[PDB]
Structures are given as C-alpha cells and as structure tokens.
Amino acid sequence: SMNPPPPETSNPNKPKRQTNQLQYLLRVVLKTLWKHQFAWPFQQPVDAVKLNLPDYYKIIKTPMDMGTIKKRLENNYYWNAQECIQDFNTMFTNCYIYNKPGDDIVLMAEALEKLFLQKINELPTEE
C-alpha cells in the first residue's frame, strides 16, 4: 500500500486574495505550531510506506498536514481563513480517528491542538 498524491496546494485558475486572517495563519499560527517539540509527525503527509501503515489511506480519505497547509497559505490557495482552519482541524481529527485514545501520537496531537486553539483565539477581525 502506496502513498497517494499529496493534497493540491496550488491552482493557477483559482482566484487569490490576501486577508489579515490568512496572513496571521501563516505568520503566527503555522509558525508557532511548526516549532513545537511535537510537530515533527505533522510536518509532512503521512508516509504510509515508511511508517508501514498499509491501511492508513483506506481509512483516512481527507489527509492533511502542516507541510501542505504551509504551501496552501504561501500559494494563496485559500479564499477564506475558515478553509485553512478546517485543514488544521482535519489534521488533528485524522490522527484521533486512525489511532487509539491515549496513544503517544494522540497526546502529541492534543497538545498541538491546544496551542492551535490558543492562537486562533487571537485571530484579527477582517480588515
């Protein structure tokens, strides 16, 4: 069992805009989460081959990771901040679905999610 292609991160035909909120998501939220001690499993698409998880992509049909989110932000892929917030939420939820309560990786995701929620609380209001 193979890795899928990664999620789409750029699309020339898709309209682009920069908002205060999208800027904060890249410069504050993504940055802070990337540097967390527990970020490393979430910095790239789940590598089902290297990690020997042949059923991962049979179960998880909306994979998401911070590598992809970074690319989406820097490529102006999102029209709305809520789309990016949804990607972060998806990343955490995938981990909770695939793994069991109390697994190390779940505790890691929970700590990242708490930090995420803290930073999102300070999202600026639209310009």
Swiss-Prot record:
Swiss-Prot/TrEMBL puts the cross-link Glycyl lysine isopeptide (Lys-Gly) (interchain with G-Cter in SUMO2) at 58
Give the site residues for Acetylated histone binding.
Answer: 99
Locations listed in the record? Nucleus; Chromosome
Post-translational modification comment from the UniProt entry: Phosphorylation by CK2 disrupt the intramolecular binding between the bromo domain 2 and the NPS region and promotes binding between the NPS and the BID regions, leading to activate the protein and promote binding to acetylated histones. In absence of phosphorylation, BRD4 does not localize to p53/TP53 target gene promoters, phosphorylation promoting recruitment to p53/TP53 target promoters.
The effect annotated for residue 99 to A is: Abolishes binding to acetylated histones
Domain Bromo, by residue range, is 17-123
Q: In which tissues is it expressed?
A: Ubiquitously expressed.
Q: Which disease is it linked to?
A: Cornelia de Lange syndrome 6: A form of Cornelia de Lange syndrome, a clinically heterogeneous developmental disorder associated with malformations affecting multiple systems. It is characterized by facial dysmorphisms, abnormal hands and feet, growth delay, cognitive retardation, hirsutism, gastroesophageal dysfunction and cardiac, ophthalmologic and genitourinary anomalies. CDLS6 inheritance is autosomal dominant.
How would you summarize the oligomeric state and partners of this protein?
Interacts with p53/TP53; the interaction is direct. Interacts (via CTD region) with CDK9 and CCNT1, acting as an associated component of P-TEFb complex. Interacts with RELA (when acetylated at 'Lys-310'). Interacts (via NET domain) with NSD3, CHD4, BICRA and ATAD5. The interaction with BICRA bridges BRD4 to the GBAF complex. Interacts (via NET domain) with JMJD6 (via JmjC and N-terminal domains); the interaction is stronger in presence of ssRNA and recruits JMJD6 on distal enhancers. Interacts with NSD3. Interacts with NIPBL. (Microbial infection) Interacts with bovine papillomavirus type 1 regulatory protein E2. This interactions may serve for the tethering of viral genomes to host mitotic chromosomes allowing successful partitioning of the viral genome during cell division.
User: Into which family does the record put it?
Assistant: Belongs to the BET family.
Misc note = JQ1, a thieno-triazolo-1,4-diazepine derivative, and I-BET, a benzodiazepine derivative, have been tested on tumors with success. Treatment with GSK1210151A (I-BET151, a I-BET derivative) has strong effets on mixed lineage leukemia and promotes myeloid differentiation and leukemia stem-cell depletion.
Domain characteristics, as noted in the entry: The NET domain mediates interaction with a number of chromatin proteins involved in transcription regulation (NSD3, JMJD6, CHD4, GLTSCR1 and ATAD5). The C-terminal (CTD) region mediates interaction and recruitment of CDK9 and CCNT1 subunits of the P-TEFb complex. It is also required for maintenance of higher-order chromatin structure.
What is the documented function of this protein?
Chromatin reader protein that recognizes and binds acetylated histones and plays a key role in transmission of epigenetic memory across cell divisions and transcription regulation. Remains associated with acetylated chromatin throughout the entire cell cycle and provides epigenetic memory for postmitotic G1 gene transcription by preserving acetylated chromatin status and maintaining high-order chromatin structure. During interphase, plays a key role in regulating the transcription of signal-inducible genes by associating with the P-TEFb complex and recruiting it to promoters.
The name under which this protein is listed is Bromodomain-containing protein 4
Where the shown chain sits in the full protein? 44 to 168 of 1362
